[PDB]
Scaffold this motif. Structure first.
Motif, PDB file in Angstrom:
ATOM      1  N   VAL A  32       0.831  -1.200   0.000  1.00 13.14           N
ATOM      2  CA  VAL A  32       0.000   0.000   0.000  1.00 13.14           C
ATOM      3  C   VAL A  32       0.868   1.254   0.000  1.00 13.14           C
ATOM      4  O   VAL A  32       0.594   2.214  -0.730  1.00 13.14           O
ATOM      5  CB  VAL A  32      -0.965  -0.021   1.199  1.00 13.14           C
ATOM      6  CG1 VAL A  32      -1.656   1.326   1.351  1.00 13.14           C
ATOM      7  CG2 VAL A  32      -1.989  -1.132   1.034  1.00 13.14           C
ATOM      8  N   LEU A  35       2.474   2.936  -3.188  1.00 13.31           N
ATOM      9  CA  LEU A  35       1.698   3.809  -4.061  1.00 13.31           C
ATOM     10  C   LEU A  35       2.078   5.276  -3.904  1.00 13.31           C
ATOM     11  O   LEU A  35       1.800   6.073  -4.805  1.00 13.31           O
ATOM     12  CB  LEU A  35       0.204   3.637  -3.782  1.00 13.31           C
ATOM     13  CG  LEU A  35      -0.447   2.383  -4.367  1.00 13.31           C
ATOM     14  CD1 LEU A  35      -1.835   2.183  -3.782  1.00 13.31           C
ATOM     15  CD2 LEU A  35      -0.511   2.462  -5.885  1.00 13.31           C
ATOM     16  N   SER A  36       2.706   5.648  -2.787  1.00 14.27           N
ATOM     17  CA  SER A  36       3.067   7.032  -2.508  1.00 14.27           C
ATOM     18  C   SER A  36       4.528   7.325  -2.836  1.00 14.27           C
ATOM     19  O   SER A  36       5.168   8.131  -2.153  1.00 14.27           O
ATOM     20  CB  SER A  36       2.778   7.367  -1.046  1.00 14.27           C
ATOM     21  OG  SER A  36       3.777   6.833  -0.194  1.00 14.27           O
TER      22      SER A  36
ATOM     23  N   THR B  33      -3.410   7.068   3.738  1.00 14.44           N
ATOM     24  CA  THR B  33      -4.530   7.206   2.817  1.00 14.44           C
ATOM     25  C   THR B  33      -5.628   8.016   3.490  1.00 14.44           C
ATOM     26  O   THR B  33      -6.048   7.692   4.606  1.00 14.44           O
ATOM     27  CB  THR B  33      -5.069   5.837   2.393  1.00 14.44           C
ATOM     28  OG1 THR B  33      -5.598   5.150   3.535  1.00 14.44           O
ATOM     29  CG2 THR B  33      -3.967   4.997   1.764  1.00 14.44           C
TER      30      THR B  33
ATOM     31  N   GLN C   5      -7.204  -1.901   5.031  1.00 13.23           N
ATOM     32  CA  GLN C   5      -6.473  -1.792   3.776  1.00 13.23           C
ATOM     33  C   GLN C   5      -7.376  -1.964   2.561  1.00 13.23           C
ATOM     34  O   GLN C   5      -6.872  -2.079   1.438  1.00 13.23           O
ATOM     35  CB  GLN C   5      -5.340  -2.821   3.740  1.00 13.23           C
ATOM     36  CG  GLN C   5      -4.079  -2.377   4.466  1.00 13.23           C
ATOM     37  CD  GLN C   5      -3.262  -3.541   4.994  1.00 13.23           C
ATOM     38  OE1 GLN C   5      -3.713  -4.686   4.989  1.00 13.23           O
ATOM     39  NE2 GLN C   5      -2.050  -3.252   5.453  1.00 13.23           N
ATOM     40  N   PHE C   7      -8.850  -0.245   0.399  1.00 11.84           N
ATOM     41  CA  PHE C   7      -8.927   1.051  -0.273  1.00 11.84           C
ATOM     42  C   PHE C   7      -8.368   1.053  -1.687  1.00 11.84           C
ATOM     43  O   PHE C   7      -8.684   1.979  -2.444  1.00 11.84           O
ATOM     44  CB  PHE C   7      -8.180   2.130   0.534  1.00 11.84           C
ATOM     45  CG  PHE C   7      -8.830   2.487   1.853  1.00 11.84           C
ATOM     46  CD1 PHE C   7     -10.131   2.115   2.135  1.00 11.84           C
ATOM     47  CD2 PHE C   7      -8.125   3.194   2.814  1.00 11.84           C
ATOM     48  CE1 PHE C   7     -10.718   2.441   3.341  1.00 11.84           C
ATOM     49  CE2 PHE C   7      -8.706   3.523   4.026  1.00 11.84           C
ATOM     50  CZ  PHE C   7     -10.003   3.145   4.290  1.00 11.84           C
ATOM     51  N   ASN C   8      -7.549   0.076  -2.069  1.00 11.89           N
ATOM     52  CA  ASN C   8      -6.937   0.023  -3.394  1.00 11.89           C
ATOM     53  C   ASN C   8      -7.193  -1.328  -4.046  1.00 11.89           C
ATOM     54  O   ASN C   8      -6.299  -1.953  -4.621  1.00 11.89           O
ATOM     55  CB  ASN C   8      -5.439   0.301  -3.315  1.00 11.89           C
ATOM     56  CG  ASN C   8      -5.129   1.626  -2.654  1.00 11.89           C
ATOM     57  OD1 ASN C   8      -5.055   2.662  -3.315  1.00 11.89           O
ATOM     58  ND2 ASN C   8      -4.946   1.601  -1.339  1.00 11.89           N
TER      59      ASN C   8
END
Ligand SMILES: *[C@@H]1O[C@H](CO)[C@@H](O[C@@H]2O[C@H](CO)[C@@H](O)[C@H](O)[C@H]2NC(C)=O)[C@H](O)[C@H]1NC(C)=O
Lengths: 49, 49, 34
Positions: A32, A35-36, B33, C5, C7-8
């Motif tokens: 996750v 992605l940043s 996020t 998690q 979210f993607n």
């Protein structure tokens, strides 16, 4: 009875399952977070570019 | 899709019963996020999912 | 977290065998061996 105590007084008896869960969670968190990353681009947000 | 003070994000702007700091700005979660954005007009917080 | 998690596109599909079914299987094995 001792078996129960062997688990009641020890929190490391479940080391294997806890380690597996932690590894999976860390892998997901890293995926996750990736992605940043700009990766050499101007920004990490599609709308921005 | 909502444009909140420069963030263009697709989601549902529900109502959140969370207490935030006096000075109100954007929100974030563990994975970096966005999950909650302020309401500029009324001092009420909105979740994003 | 696993539940935080989603979210993607991260979908954690459920296990086929619920914990109750696994407990029932273990109880059946225990009864059989006893
Ligand atoms: C933003 O502006 C609106 C427009 O006036 C304000 O709305 C008023 O809010 C007060 C507080 O609850 C109410 O008593 C009034 O009846 C509202 N009037 C209208 C016409 O909506 C709102 O309060 C303002 N918000 C801030 C934080 O200043």
């Amino acid at each position: 009875g001792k078996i129960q105590d062997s688990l009641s007084s020890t929190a490391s008896a479940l080391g294997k399952l806890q380690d597996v869960v932690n590894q999976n969670a860390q892998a997901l968190n890293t995926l996750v977070k990736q992605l940043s990353s700009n990766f050499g681009a101007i920004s990490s947000v599609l709308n921005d570019i | 899709n909502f444009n909140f003070n420069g963030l263009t994000g697709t989601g549902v702007l529900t109502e959140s019963n969370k207490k935030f700091l006096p000075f109100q700005q954007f929100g974030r979660d563990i994975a970096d996020t966005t999950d909650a954005v302020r309401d500029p007009q009324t001092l009420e917080i909105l979740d994003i999912t | 977290l696993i539940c935080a998690q989603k979210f993607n596109g991260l979908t954690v599909l459920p296990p086929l065998l619920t914990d109750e079914m696994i407990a029932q299987y273990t109880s059946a094995l225990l009864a059989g061996t006893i």
